[PDB]
């Protein structure tokens, strides 16, 4: 059975905050299609060949 991820338990005290002390500059990537290949059929050749 697949696991949905790790089981982390963040504290929820009445007066407690997590302030980061370091920075990490990450560079991700995303692939997005722009267009397809333009096609055009021959309605007189595909239907009737010679």
């Amino acid at each position: 059975t697949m696991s949905l991820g790790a089981e982390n338990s963040v504290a929820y005290s009445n007066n407690s905050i997590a302030i980061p002390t370091n920075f990490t500059i990450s560079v991700t990537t995303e692939i997005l299609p722009v267009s397809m290949t333009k096609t055009s059929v021959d309605c007189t050749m595909y239907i009737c060949g010679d």
């Binding site: 055009s40 021959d42 007189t44 050749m45």
Partner: protein, 49 residues
């Protein structure tokens, strides 16, 4: 004629397709071989009764 309008706008329009029709026609068959013995059958002295 491909568009029902005598005032064609500015642009490129796809008209009917063209097809180059052939001119000559060749019919090539395998080489002639394996002749029949009819040449020897119709040439003899005593054929049959």
């Amino acid at each position: 004629c491909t568009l029902k309008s005598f005032t064609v706008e500015k642009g490129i329009y796809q008209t009917s397709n063209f097809r180059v029709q052939p001119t000559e026609s060749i019919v090539r068959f395998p080489n002639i071989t394996n002749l029949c013995p009819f040449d020897e059958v119709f040439n003899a002295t005593r054929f049959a009764s």
